[PDB]
Amino acid sequence: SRLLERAARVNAEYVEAFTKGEVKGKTGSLTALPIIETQAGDVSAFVPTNVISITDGQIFLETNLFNAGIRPA
Amino acid sequence: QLNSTEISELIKQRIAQFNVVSEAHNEGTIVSVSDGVIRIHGLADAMQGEMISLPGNRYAIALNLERDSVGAVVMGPYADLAEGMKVKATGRILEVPVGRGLLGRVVNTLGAPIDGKGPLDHDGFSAVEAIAPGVIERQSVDQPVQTGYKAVDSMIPIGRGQRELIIGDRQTGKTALAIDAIINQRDSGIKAIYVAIGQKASTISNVVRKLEEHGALANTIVVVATASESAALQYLAPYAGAAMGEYFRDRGEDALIIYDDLSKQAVAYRQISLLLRRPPGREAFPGDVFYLHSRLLERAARVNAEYVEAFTKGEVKGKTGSLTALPIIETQAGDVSAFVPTNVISITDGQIFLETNLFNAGIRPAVNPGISVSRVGGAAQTKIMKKLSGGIRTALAQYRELAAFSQFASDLDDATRKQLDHGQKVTELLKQKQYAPMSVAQQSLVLFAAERGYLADVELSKIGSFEAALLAYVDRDHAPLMQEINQTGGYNDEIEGKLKGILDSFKATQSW
Amino acid sequence: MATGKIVQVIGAVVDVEFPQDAVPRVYDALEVQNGNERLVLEVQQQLGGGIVRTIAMGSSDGLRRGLDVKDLEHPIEVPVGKATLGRIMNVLGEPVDMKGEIGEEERWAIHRAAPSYEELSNSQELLETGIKVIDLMAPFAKGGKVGLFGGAGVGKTVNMMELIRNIAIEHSGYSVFAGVGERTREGNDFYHEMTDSNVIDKVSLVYGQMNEPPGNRLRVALTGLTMAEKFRDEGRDVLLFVDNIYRYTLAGTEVSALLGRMPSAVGYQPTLAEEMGVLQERITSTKTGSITSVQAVYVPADDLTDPSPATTFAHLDATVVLSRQIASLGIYPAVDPLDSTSRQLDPLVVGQEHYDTARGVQSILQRYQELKDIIAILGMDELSEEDKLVVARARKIQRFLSQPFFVAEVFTGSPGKYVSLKDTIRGFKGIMEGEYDHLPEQAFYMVGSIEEAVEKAKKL
Amino acid sequence: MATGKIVQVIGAVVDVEFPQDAVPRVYDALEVQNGNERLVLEVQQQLGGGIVRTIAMGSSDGLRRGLDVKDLEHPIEVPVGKATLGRIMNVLGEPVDMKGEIGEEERWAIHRAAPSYEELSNSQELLETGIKVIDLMAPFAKGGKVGLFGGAGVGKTVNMMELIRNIAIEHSGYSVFAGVGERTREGNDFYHEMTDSNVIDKVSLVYGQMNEPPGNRLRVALTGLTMAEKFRDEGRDVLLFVDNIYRYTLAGTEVSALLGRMPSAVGYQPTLAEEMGVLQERITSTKTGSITSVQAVYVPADDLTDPSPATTFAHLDATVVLSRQIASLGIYPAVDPLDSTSRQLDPLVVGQEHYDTARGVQSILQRYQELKDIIAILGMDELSEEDKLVVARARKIQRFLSQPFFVAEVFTGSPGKYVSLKDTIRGFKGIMEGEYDHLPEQAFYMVGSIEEAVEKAKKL
Amino acid sequence: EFITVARPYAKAAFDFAVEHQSVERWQDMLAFAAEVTKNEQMAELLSGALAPETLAESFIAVAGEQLDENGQNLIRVMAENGRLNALPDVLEQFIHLRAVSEATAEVDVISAAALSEQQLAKISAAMEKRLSRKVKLNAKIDKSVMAGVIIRAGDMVIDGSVRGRLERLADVL
Ligand SMILES: Nc1ncnc2c1ncn2[C@@H]1O[C@H](COP(=O)(O)OP(=O)(O)OP(=O)(O)O)[C@@H](O)[C@H]1O
Ligand SMILES: Nc1ncnc2c1ncn2[C@@H]1O[C@H](COP(=O)(O)OP(=O)(O)O)[C@@H](O)[C@H]1O
Ligand SMILES: Nc1ncnc2c1ncn2[C@@H]1O[C@H](COP(=O)(O)OP(=O)(O)O)[C@@H](O)[C@H]1O
Ligand SMILES: [Mg+2]
Ligand SMILES: [Mg+2]
């Protein structure tokens, strides 16, 4: 969590204060795409549960689709 | 903050004089007793694997030499022991009495006789734990071990120095097949050993008198560790049996050994390991367990004559010895995707899988093709049997899978009415009654008559009477050849003509 | 003279400290004055420094630290012999009936080794129980183990009472009933039903029920067994009933957890297959006598692979299944002949004629099992002329299996019958090979030998 | 000279006490006079008091505590280079065939760092194997890693022997074979095959077979990999065959608990992934030389999700997954084409026609898998007249994936077949588009190119 | 805390001291070791992972006033086990054991002010009748009692303080 909550969009006043001027109007952003591997598609594991609870969304890639030819699955 | 087996009066003895090592290093005192595991204090001279002698006549095996105490396991009734008993270390690594004089005796795992016939005429002692012959000392297994059974000798051939797992569910003829192989081995010079692990004593007594009836017992050693007996005896019992087989192996003879349930050896070793607080793994078995079975079964080997010369100090020049192991494994509900069954499948050469469905349906012995294999293969067989039996196990693998898939009807009848009638005729022919061993000559002529079509049309059934007549007609008159073909195993067009002439004469004259 | 001191009390586990040299042995029994009542402790482990860890054969509440403990120099000892017939006792061999006292002449320790290899009987023999279904489809080896798998209402208790009766009257043995880890209600009503049937004079009862501390439920089976062993030494044939061996396993698991040992394959104790074998190996035939055993078995979650069923089935020689469907048909005993099993149905063991008779009966019944389903959807008149005959013979075989029991007269009034093995072999050969086709199926119902079936058909 | 003493012996691990000014480093070797033999210990940990935990590279029995041990101040070192070619060696680099000493000029420590990142090299050069399924589904390149996954008895070793025969004989550079915890019988049968084929002069052999104690099995893969690394640094290109890598991790699990490390997920050592990656990362091709390697990877209890297979899968480039279900069919090679993959199965590397043929084979085999559950319940008749066509083609594909092997020529009598990449894509492309719709399924079982299937169809 | 680790060593030391008629010397020896155990520099040494043997020698050296039987053996056995920090408790346990065999009780009395030495002698003789030991009173002047006395005889206590009666009355209300 304290790794992933570091990916943020930041408003113009934070940028202008952090850089002590020299930047104005602009917003900062950092986008995070963590990757997780699941064992036989089980989501009920420990680390998958935590990371699925932390993030803003999930892209589920499945092997039954990938084998059928639907790529990206 | 916890104590570490330092107690008031031992601390007092150290108080009297710190260097208590001025006393004998040869002995110590029991400090605790729990579920057959024992902790001993003293024994500075003890070495791992050593036999420790207890009051009475009992032994313990030193497993742990810790900072200040020895952890051991008791090979017998442990409840008689108590704290403070004086204990002496024999300077001997665990050793069992061994020799040819053990043949026909029933002995405890320690080689103490259990029949009423008095002491043993053993040759010497040999270490229970040993490392098998190295990669360069082996020789290729290329000699047959004929069993009683037409199904296994045709499909799953066993050779001198091979290791054949016999795996199946409970009550499927695992013991029947192994003891019936022991019975067939008499009058063929190869010795046999039967190690009953975790068996109930009524069954062991039954099979011992059943081996005595057939005259097999004079040929074989029996090692017994019944279900009542301490787990240390149970898991050590197969290593004692292997130590007895290995003597014959290293003297350049042939021996056969049956471990009557490795799957109970594993449970006894799991008990000993969990009592010693070791972290378990899959199915709660220790991490060791594969090493448990591997170091045991790799001992069954065939050794080249240079190794027999180097071992016997020249005395036996130019003979090759072997030990042939047939461990039995019992699997719950017929699945082989289990930890211990798959461990032993990973160690043994072949695999005879006995199936419960076939066994109920009356196909006995229930040798399931396709799953069962021999990784040595045709090199074990006599060339007559090799040439006659060819690829039939794979043919049945597909015949079984296709009769399972094509259930609705016999559609696409190109030759499936021949193929499936042949596969039925063969499965009916392989069925055999126990304690009726067929010589290689009888198996060869029957499989010849079956395999190349000569009876694929006649689904008469009545098959058992046809075979029992055929083998009598050839025994009484038609074949002096039986004594010849049982000796040479030779395959020749001349002999094929001889046998096909007998086959046509019987098949024309006699209506089954 | 007491010599030990209680040093810990944690649940049912009690640690007591002795002089460094007087340490008790492993299975010795100690005792303590827990207020006014005396309490018995069975030692389980010897720890370092004279400390000994034991389990209380009773309620642990009220024990102080420092109480004086007296070391009895022997294991738990119980009364044995004729004196115990018709009584009720607990683990400690104390009467929990109120008829007073047991005038035993001798007392035996409950712990001992199984018979030696040279001591087992060098023979194999059957036990004629007198019940047609059991004698035919699932014979009893003299000295074997038998499993009972039925549920409730199926008449299990009447089966046990009929066995207790027949082993005493027709044979000349006694019986021991060890009720381990079962309802007190059922033991009370079972005692009342056995005294209302004049069989109480022939059976000795021992009870450790569900309301008992773990050690009682653990050692009650060994108390029952050591009484059966005293009957064996006298030269008799004995029956030992274990009302639920699964509860013996489960109480061993509880005690193992209390002692703090690591959990085995499914949480069971690591010593499971040893604790089971140490019991089941004493139930054997010997060349002085024999103990046969009938054990009610319970399969957790209907799983025949669970370590407890898997360990128990290794020992059972025969298996009798009781089904409610057979009882709804009004057939008693409600033994299911298709699933009932015995490893003594081996044509070399019991003979070719008996073997093939049982196999024929089974094949007939499992054909009828499918013809019944065809009838249920297509009607009777769809069956060919051959199937209509196997149905007619199946419905008669299915009824010749019923029997009147000497103990069931209070229900059916019939005098009750003891049927010899060869006579039921004759009867089923008859019915099966078309003989006796010329009488109605009701002429076989609730009757003894087949001659009584033909005579009932005459009267009918 | 000898300066330390044994203070504990727990199975395979030994604790040794030294003066605190002379304590060995954390991978040095030590020597002990075990009876009359000489035993080598490798130190794994430095505990605090001049004590040291070590693993015995040999049998541990006979060790007393208090023996003197001698501090060799260098790690385990093995002979390396040209001198070690036609010979078999121990884990300690000692010769194990009965020939004389090894004539090496140089010896290398078996613990070494992996090559740097700027030093690696990657190659697209496709390597051709005679095996239809392996090169069609999972083609692998020169200098890549191949791994064969399977349970027990599925075909890992027979396939590795076929790969040895088909690449490694018609290959110029030297070769190294490491037997890690497998059968000595198969090592002897391999050594005699090589010596009777006069190719032994090119194949260096190391054996630490399953009879050896844990230390030999643990280190033997590292000592075989050191010899492969030496041949790589000379600028050559090398073949490395590892006959069961799983045994390396298993020997680490067996030792792990004794070293006092808390157990992990399923029992495995906490360091499973680092122990595996420290070996796996240094078996790689560099800019000076290339190592092509085939590893067998046993999967326990057929569980592909067990931590050891799951953490092994990331290291390899081509993974071939054998399955027991397909072997039970008798369809060897029992490759699962829906689980096998390669890094090289891309259209830019392989070419569009190969890529499309492989994807079409996967697509219709997946569609057949999706049909199987409805075929199991309802039966086939319910399928669409489209669905029956993809089922018939998928079954014909499953048969055509089978192939006879020159090394399997002793389990079946069939002659071995070598199938070129062109012929296999020509046949699979022919089957998929229905030009062979008229042949029976048995025409495709155990054949070479499709022109042998058309012939086999004539003979039924 | 390590009462449980100190029990065996205290029992061994005492049971040895009565075989050699020197309980009184052993007590002062253990008291000396218990004081050396508390020093700030020695407590830094005992935490350090020296070899038990050299750490024992580094502990013998700072105490030469010690028997061959007592220091050079007990300290070494405790060092092998790493128990030296337990010495302050091995002392107390030792004392207690002695008081047990000598049939003595260290009754403590607490009061708001000094007792008349007739009150206190009556207390002695009365506790010696309540118990079955020679008592050894020691008083404490605690003002919060205000009047009366507390008599503590181990885990048994008799409270006659007016504060105790006041707070009990407070809870009767
Ligand atoms: N080929 C056969 N034909 C007929 N009966 C057989 C045959 N083989 C075995 N039997 C019988 O089937 C029963 C089971 O055999 P057996 O008891 O040896 O099986 P098992 O698997 O060894 O049993 P367990 O697993 O309990 O040890 C026995 O009564 C035996 O006589
Ligand atoms: N041999 C028999 N003859 C007649 N009726 C029987 C017989 N066996 C059982 N029954 C009937 O089945 C009932 C089952 O009740 P019960 O024996 O209490 O079941 P359980 O003992 O399993 O609790 C009996 O009360 C009786 O009515
Ligand atoms: N192509 C094949 N033809 C015939 N049998 C095969 C083939 N491939 C594998 N097998 C069978 O697989 C069995 C075990 O093969 P092996 O390589 O030893 O398995 P593993 O090494 O994976 O345990 C052998 O008995 C062999 O007959
Ligand atoms: Mg059996
Ligand atoms: Mg393999």
Backbone angles phi and psi of D110, in degrees to 5? -80, -10
Q: From its phi and psi, is residue A22 left (phi > 0), alpha (psi between -120 and 50) or beta?
A: left
The structure tokens listed for D182 are 């497998």
CB B266 within 8 A of CB B289: yes
Distance, first Cα to last Cα, chain C: 77
Say which amino acid occupies B283.
E
Beta bridge partners of B164: B350
Chosen for mutation from B12, B19, B31 (greatest number of chain E CBs closer than 10 Å) is B12
The structure tokens listed for D24 are 């060995």
Compute, in degrees rounded to 10, the torsion defined by CA atoms B463, B469, B474, B477.
-160
C-alpha to C-alpha distances, D385 to B463, C367, D361, D381, D388, nearest whole angstrom = 44, 38, 20, 9, 5
SS (H, E, C) D54-121: EEECCCCCCCECCCEEEEEEEECEEECCHHHCCCEECCCCCECCCCCCCCCCCEEECCCCCCCHHHEC
For C264, nearest residue in chain B (alpha carbons): B284
Q: Which long-range contacts (CB under 8 A, 24 or more apart) does E48-55 make?
A: E49/D48, E49/D49, E50/D20, E50/D49, E51/D17, E51/D20, E51/D49, E51/D50, E52/D49, E52/E79, E52/E80, E52/E82, E53/E79, E54/D20, E55/E79, E55/E84
Residue B384: name the closest of B438, B436, B432, B445 by CA.
B445
Q: DSSP code of B448?
A: H
For D214, nearest residue in chain B (alpha carbons): B291
Whether residues D419 and D452 fall in one domain: yes
CB of D294 sitting under 6 A from ligand 3:
no
Q: Which long-range contacts (CB under 8 A, 24 or more apart) does B449-456 make?
A: B449/B503, B450/B425, B450/B426, B451/B388, B451/B389, B451/B390, B451/B392, B451/B426, B453/B422, B454/B503, B454/B507, B455/B425, B456/B418, B456/B421, B456/B422, B456/B425
Nearest C-alpha of chain E: how many angstroms from B4? 8
Could you give the angle at the alpha carbon of D77 between the alpha carbons of D76 and D80, nearest 5°? 150
Helix (H, G, I), strand (E, B) or coil at C79: strand
Whether residues D33 and D88 fall in one domain: no
D150 is annotated as contributing to ligand binding: yes
Under 8 Å CB-to-CB from E129, ≥6 apart: which residues?
Answer: none
Under 8 Å CB-to-CB from C200, ≥6 apart: which residues?
Answer: C86, C191, C194
Beta bridge partners of C42: C29, C55
CB B61 within 8 A of CB D11: no
CB D252 within 8 A of CB D6: no
D155 is annotated as contributing to ligand binding: yes
Provide the CA C115 distance to its chain's centre, in angstroms: 20
Chains sharing 3 or more CB pairs under 8 A with chain D: A, B, E
- Sign of the C-alpha dihedral, residues B257, B260, B263, B267? negative
The overall longest dimension of chain D from CA atoms, in Å, is 85
Q: Which CATH code, of 3.10.105.10, 1.10.10.10, 3.30.1360.30, 1.10.520.20, is assigned to E3-101?
A: 1.10.520.20
Total structural domains within chain D: 3
The structure tokens listed for C142 are 């003299």
D touches E, CB cut-off 8 Å, minimum 3 pairs: yes
Structural domains of chain B in order of their starting residue, each with its CATH number? 1-92 (2.40.30.20), 93-381 (3.40.50.300), 382-512 (1.20.150.20)
Helix (H, G, I), strand (E, B) or coil at C126: strand
Whole-angstrom distance, CA of residue C208 vs CA of residue C214: 9
Annotation marks residue B67 as catalytic: no
- Mutation test of ligand 1: which of B166, B170, B172 has the most ligand atoms closer than 8 Å to its C-beta? B172
- Which residue, C308, C326, C344, sits at the end of a domain? C344
Provide the CA B157 distance to its chain's centre, in angstroms: 15
Whole-angstrom distance, CA of residue B343 vs CA of residue B286: 13
Whole-angstrom distance, CA of residue E135 vs CA of residue E154: 12
Whole-angstrom distance, CA of residue B282 vs CA of residue D267: 7
CB contact under 8 A, B135 and D210: no
Asked if the peptide bond before residue D270 counts as cis, ω within 30 degrees of 0, the response is: no
CB B147 within 8 A of CB B181: yes
Backbone angles phi and psi of A57, in degrees to 5? 175, 175
Under 8 Å CB-to-CB from B349, ≥6 apart: which residues?
Answer: B162, B163, B164, B374, B375, B376, D183, D185
Q: DSSP code of C430?
A: H
Helix (H, G, I), strand (E, B) or coil at D253: helix
CB D72 within 8 A of CB D107: no
Quick check: B32 contacting C, CB < 8 Å? yes
CB of D332 sitting under 6 A from ligand 3:
yes
Q: Write out the DSSP string of B464-501.
A: HHHHHHHHHHIIIII-THHHHHHHH----HHHHHHHHH
Provide the CA B402 distance to its chain's centre, in angstroms: 34
Beta bridge partners of E49: none
Q: Write out the DSSP string of A3-59.
A: TGGG--EE-HHHHHHHTTSS--S--EE---------STT---SHHHHHHHHHSS---
Could you give the angle at the alpha carbon of D99 between the alpha carbons of D98 and D100, nearest 5°? 125
Whole-angstrom distance, CA of residue B429 vs CA of residue C323: 38
CB C248 within 8 A of CB C181: yes
Q: For residue D437, what are the domain limits?
A: 345-460
Whole-angstrom distance, CA of residue C15 vs CA of residue C30: 11
Q: Write out the DSSP string of D355-403.
A: HHHHHHHHHHHHHHHHHHHHHHHT-GGGS-TTHHHHHHHHHHHHHHT--
Whole-angstrom distance, CA of residue E153 vs CA of residue C122: 73
Whole-angstrom distance, CA of residue E26 vs CA of residue E169: 49
Distance, first Cα to last Cα, chain D: 78
Burial class (CB in 10 A: 0-12, 13-18, 19+), E170: exposed
Under 8 Å CB-to-CB from C95, ≥6 apart: which residues?
Answer: C87, C88, C89, C101, C102
Catalytic residue among C42, C128, C162, C182: C182
Could you give the angle at the alpha carbon of D177 between the alpha carbons of D234 and B164, nearest 5°? 180
Whole-angstrom distance, CA of residue C143 vs CA of residue C163: 15
Backbone angles phi and psi of C46, in degrees to 5? -105, 110
Tell me the pairing of strands D290-298 and D145-150.
Answer: parallel
CB C383 within 8 A of CB C111: no
Burial class (CB in 10 A: 0-12, 13-18, 19+), E143: exposed
Q: How big is chain B, counted in residues?
A: 512
The structure tokens listed for B21 are 């090592």
Helix (H, G, I), strand (E, B) or coil at C22: coil
Angle between helices B8-16 and E3-17 (to 10 degrees): 50
Backbone angles phi and psi of B70, in degrees to 5? -105, 130
CB D317 within 8 A of CB D343: yes
The structure tokens listed for C267 are 């949480």
Contacts of D305 in chain A (CB under 8 A): 39-40
Cα within 13 Å of Cα(C27), Cβ side: 16
Q: How big is chain A, counted in residues?
A: 73
CB B213 within 8 A of CB B207: no
CB B42 within 8 A of CB B77: no
Whole-angstrom distance, CA of residue D404 vs CA of residue D155: 13
Burial class (CB in 10 A: 0-12, 13-18, 19+), B50: buried
> Looking at the partner chain, which of B7, B170, B226 has a beta carbon nearest the beta carbon of C313?
B170
D81 is annotated as contributing to ligand binding: no
Whether residues C176 and C67 fall in one domain: no
Q: How big is chain D, counted in residues?
A: 460
Q: How big is chain E, counted in residues?
A: 173
Could you give the angle at the alpha carbon of C122 between the alpha carbons of C121 and C124, nearest 5°? 85
Whether residues C105 and C57 fall in one domain: no
The structure tokens listed for D164 are 């040895």
Say which amino acid occupies D456.
K
Contacts of B209 in chain C (CB under 8 A): 122
CB D222 within 8 A of CB D170: no
CB B447 within 8 A of CB B154: yes
Helix (H) or strand (E) holding B59, with range, is strand B58-65
- Sign of the C-alpha dihedral, residues B242, B247, B252, B253? negative
SS (H, E, C) C248-291: HHHHHHHHHHHHCCCCCCCCCCCCHHHHHHHHHCCCCEECCEEE
Residue with tokens 């107690």: B7
C-alpha to C-alpha distances, C317 to C151, C233, C297, C313, D337, nearest whole angstrom = 20, 23, 13, 8, 48
The structure tokens listed for D194 are 């090589």
C-alpha to C-alpha distances, D279 to B367, D12, D76, D219, nearest whole angstrom = 43, 22, 16, 10
CB C232 within 8 A of CB C286: yes
Whether residues C179 and C46 fall in one domain: no
- Which residue, D318, D344, D370, sits at the end of a domain? D344
Whether residues C367 and C300 fall in one domain: no
Whole-angstrom distance, CA of residue B346 vs CA of residue D23: 41
Kindly report the CATH number assigned to the domain that includes residue D408: 1.10.1140.10
Under 8 Å CB-to-CB from D195, ≥6 apart: which residues?
Answer: none
Burial class (CB in 10 A: 0-12, 13-18, 19+), B171: middle
Whether residues C318 and C374 fall in one domain: no
> Looking at the partner chain, which of B7, B115, B275 has a beta carbon nearest the beta carbon of C270?
B275
SS (H, E, C) D283-319: CCCECCCEEEEEEEEECHHHCCCCHHHHHHHCCCCEE
Whether residues C279 and C387 fall in one domain: no
For A69, nearest residue in chain D (alpha carbons): D363
Question: Which residues neighbour ligand 5 (ion) by CB within 5 Å?
Answer: D 157
The structure tokens listed for E43 are 């407590």
Q: Write out the DSSP string of B76-116.
A: S--TT--TT-EEEEEEEESEEEESGGGTT-EE-TTS-B-SS
Chosen for mutation from B35, B179, B265 (greatest number of chain C CBs closer than 10 Å) is B35
Whether residues D223 and D211 fall in one domain: yes
Whole-angstrom distance, CA of residue D239 vs CA of residue D225: 11
Q: Where are the alpha helices (DSSP H) in B366-456?
A: 383-389, 392-405, 416-430, 440-451
Query: CA gyration radius for chain D?
Result: 25
Strands (E) in C171-236, as ranges, are 174-180, 203-208
Quick check: A53 contacting D, CB < 8 Å? no
D74 CB neighbour count, 10 Å cutoff = 11
Which atom of ligand 3 is closest in space to residue D152's alpha carbon?
23
Angle between helices E52-60 and E40-47 (to 10 degrees): 160
Q: What is the resolution of this structure in A?
A: 3.3
Kindly report the CATH number assigned to the domain that includes residue C335: 3.40.50.300
CB C106 within 8 A of CB C80: yes
Compute, in degrees rounded to 10, the torsion defined by CA atoms B311, B313, B317, B321.
-20
Under 8 Å CB-to-CB from B259, ≥6 apart: which residues?
Answer: B195, B197, B238, B241, B265, B296, B325, B326, B327, B328
Beta bridge partners of E44: none
Q: How far is the CA of B345 from the centre of ligand 5 (A)?
A: 8
Whether residues C93 and C57 fall in one domain: no
Backbone angles phi and psi of D415, in degrees to 5? -65, 145
CB of D231 sitting under 6 A from ligand 3:
no
- Which residue, D75, D107, D128, sits at the end of a domain? D75
Residue with tokens 């599925």: D154
The structure tokens listed for B329 are 């494994």
Whole-angstrom distance, CA of residue D410 vs CA of residue B246: 29
C-alpha to C-alpha distances, B444 to B158, B369, B490, D81, D217, nearest whole angstrom = 16, 19, 11, 54, 44
- In B, residues 212-241, which contact C (CB 8 Å cutoff)? 224, 226-228, 230-231
Quick check: E50 contacting D, CB < 8 Å? yes
Which atom of ligand 3 is closest in space to residue D322's alpha carbon?
22
- Sign of the C-alpha dihedral, residues B204, B210, B213, B216? negative
Whether residues C279 and C206 fall in one domain: yes
Could you give the angle at the alpha carbon of B439 between the alpha carbons of B139 and B425, nearest 5°? 110
> Looking at the partner chain, which of D305, D310, D338 has a beta carbon nearest the beta carbon of A67?
D338
Whole-angstrom distance, CA of residue C424 vs CA of residue B39: 61
C-alpha to C-alpha distances, A8 to A1, A31, A54, A70, B479, nearest whole angstrom = 13, 7, 13, 32, 94
Whether residues C122 and C56 fall in one domain: no
The structure tokens listed for C97 are 């009936």
Q: Which residues of E touch B (CB under 8 A)?
A: 1-2, 4-5, 8-9, 11-13, 15-16, 69-70, 72-74, 76-77, 81
